[PDB]
Amino acid sequence: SSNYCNQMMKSRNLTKDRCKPVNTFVHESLADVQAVCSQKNVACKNGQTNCYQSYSTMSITDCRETGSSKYPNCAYKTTQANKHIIVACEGNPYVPVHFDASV
């Protein structure tokens, strides 16, 4: 529903101290998301080189601040999509630590 982001951004404490402008939720298994770290190595949006794009399309939800959104009254727009996800990976085991973008 259109309510998804409004509820999720809140419950995930992404509206606690600020209105987190954008946030993407991935509706795939953890294993499939973690596996992206072993896939197409691409440049992060900030230029860093430890980002990886998923070979296949994943089901995601994009949460975006509405124009009337202002802390402490946050408000979001829910957008469902099926895109390749790009994440920044690090550590041992090599797993995502940042969600870069979607293409």
Binding site: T24, H27, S29, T61, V95, V97
Partner: peptide, 15 residues
């Protein structure tokens, strides 16, 4: 026990 890896799951995972 909170790590960058767990933080990612908290923020982005929703199976």
């Amino acid at each position: 026990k909170e790590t960058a890896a767990x933080k990612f799951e908290x923020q982005h995972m929703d199976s």
